Amino acid sequence: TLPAVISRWLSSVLPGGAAPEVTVESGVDSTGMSSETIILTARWQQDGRSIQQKLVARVAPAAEDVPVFPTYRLDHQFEVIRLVGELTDVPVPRVRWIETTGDVLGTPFFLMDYVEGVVPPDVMPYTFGDNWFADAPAERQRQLQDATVAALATLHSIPNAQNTFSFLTDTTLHRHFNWVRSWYDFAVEGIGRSPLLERTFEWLQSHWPDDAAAREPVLLWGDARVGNVLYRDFQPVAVLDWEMVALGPRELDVAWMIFAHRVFQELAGLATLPGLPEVMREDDVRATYQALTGVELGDLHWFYVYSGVMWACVFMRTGARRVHFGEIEKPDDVESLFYHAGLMKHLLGEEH
Ligand SMILES: Nc1ncnc2c1ncn2[C@@H]1O[C@H](COP(=O)(O)OP(=O)(O)OP(=O)(O)O)[C@@H](O)[C@H]1O
Ligand SMILES: [Ca+2]
Numbered sequence: 001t002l003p004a005v006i007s008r009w010l011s012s013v014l015p016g017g018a019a020p021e022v023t024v025e026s027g028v029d030s031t032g033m034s035s036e037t038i039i040l041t042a043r044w045q046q047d048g049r050s051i052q053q054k055l056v057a058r059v060a061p062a063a064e065d066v067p068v069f070p071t072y073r074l075d076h077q078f079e080v081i082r083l084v085g086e087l088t089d090v091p092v093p094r095v096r097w098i099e100t101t102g103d104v105l106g107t108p109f110f111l112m113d114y115v116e117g118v119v120p121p122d123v124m125p126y127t128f129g130d131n132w133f134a135d136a137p138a139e140r141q142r143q144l145q146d147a148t149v150a151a152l153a154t155l156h157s158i159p160n161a162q163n164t165f166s167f168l169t170d171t172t173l174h175r176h177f178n179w180v181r182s183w184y185d186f187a188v189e190g191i192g193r194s195p196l197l198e199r200t201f202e203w204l205q206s207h208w209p210d211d212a213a214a215r216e217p218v219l220l221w222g223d224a225r226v227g228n229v230l231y232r233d234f235q236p237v238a239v240l241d242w243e244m245v246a247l248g249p250r251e252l253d254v255a256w257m258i259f260a261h262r263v264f265q266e267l268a269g270l271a272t273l274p275g276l277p278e279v280m281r282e283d284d285v286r287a288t289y290q291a292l293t294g295v296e297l298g299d300l301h302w303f304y305v306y307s308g309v310m311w312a313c314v315f316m317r318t319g320a321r322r323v324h325f326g327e328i329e330k331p332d333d334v335e336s337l338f339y340h341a342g343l344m345k346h347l348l349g350e351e352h
């Protein structure tokens with residue numbers, strides 16, 4: 001049915017007699033969980049020869065699926081990826097079709113071209129070693145890191161960001177912050193409350209980063225991390241996963257990228273592995289970013305704490321879905337799911 005639909009759209013844009021056939025390459029992750037990103041193969045005839053194209057569909061989840069997010073705007077993700085392609089040389093996939101109604105499949109989706117390359121893995125976290133990124137030479141890992149920071153810098157350098165990306169919206173942080181509170185509330189409905197998150201929201205309110213929030217907002221990638229970039233030869237070839245795209249202070253993206261790797265360092269520590277301590281260090285990342293944009297970054301501390309709430313929110317949703325599908329037993333304290341609770345307790349104990 002996803003394939004039938006793409007086959008149909010294919011029939012409308014290719015020569016008559018193309019007779020396209022679409023099948024699914026990959027509709028689940030490596031743990032057999034159904035995926036929002038679906039890799040498709042399209043085969044057709046042209047001038048008596050076979051053409052074969054891979055296509056990637058991003059589909060909006062149904063309620064029955066236990067969605068991470070309270071709402072979905074794939075149309076926004078579509079337009080941002082398209083605009084990023086038009087206005088920068090940040091590598092992104094070419095977008096092909098958006099169906100915004102949900103009348104065709106049941107739910108909205110968009111279609112992208114396939115980009116070949118490798119991604120530093122989430123399963124197992126790349127900090128666990130035994131993958132192409134963890135096993136590369138220091139120098140090559142650092143070359144990847146700096147290219148990824150450079151892609152970020154380039155996205156943050158797009159002029160008149162709030163004009164160009166206005167469909168995305170006090171300030172942009174205030175608004176982003178109320179969205180995060182909505183997401184938490186959404187997650188509560190599925191797993192129960194976290195006294196830690198609640199105290200953290202009070203903390204974030206009462207220690208607002210005024211200067212950062214009063215500067216000019218930039219386009220924020222969102223889930224800005226190496227696991228959302230396809231790479232060929234340690235250089236980015238597609239920036240993926242724009243579902244948390246927003247307008248906001250540039251610190252959010254930079255903090256997220258650093259913190260993300262911290263979460264995986266922590267996971268590696270708990271599997272008693274050494275991980276990758278020289279990758280994505282705050283000092284290295286700040287220096288590169290600052291060298292490239294000539295822009296001084298605010299203290300990231302508040303934005304680490306904030307990324308920690310957002311990560312906790314993902315874990316609460318991961319948790320709801322795992323218990324819904326019987327795959328794990330409800331933990332009795334939801335905070336047991338937060339690998340990084342320790343990290344956050346220590347950040348909250350700091351004074352900046
Ligand atoms: N345009 C594309 N071309 C080739 N492969 C892609 C493309 N988009 C996604 N993929 C494959 O699917 C994986 C998932 O992509 P993405 O991270 O955008 O999906 P997801 O559903 O949001 O996120 P997660 O991996 O966080 O669940 C990517 O690592 C990549 O292997
Ligand atoms: Ca371009």
Ligand SMILES: [Ca+2]
Nearest residue numbers: 348349350351
């Ligand atoms: Ca203290």
Ligand SMILES: [Mg+2]
Nearest residue numbers: 223227228241
């Ligand atoms: Mg992803």
Ligand SMILES: [Mg+2]
Nearest residue numbers: 223241242243
């Ligand atoms: Mg995602």
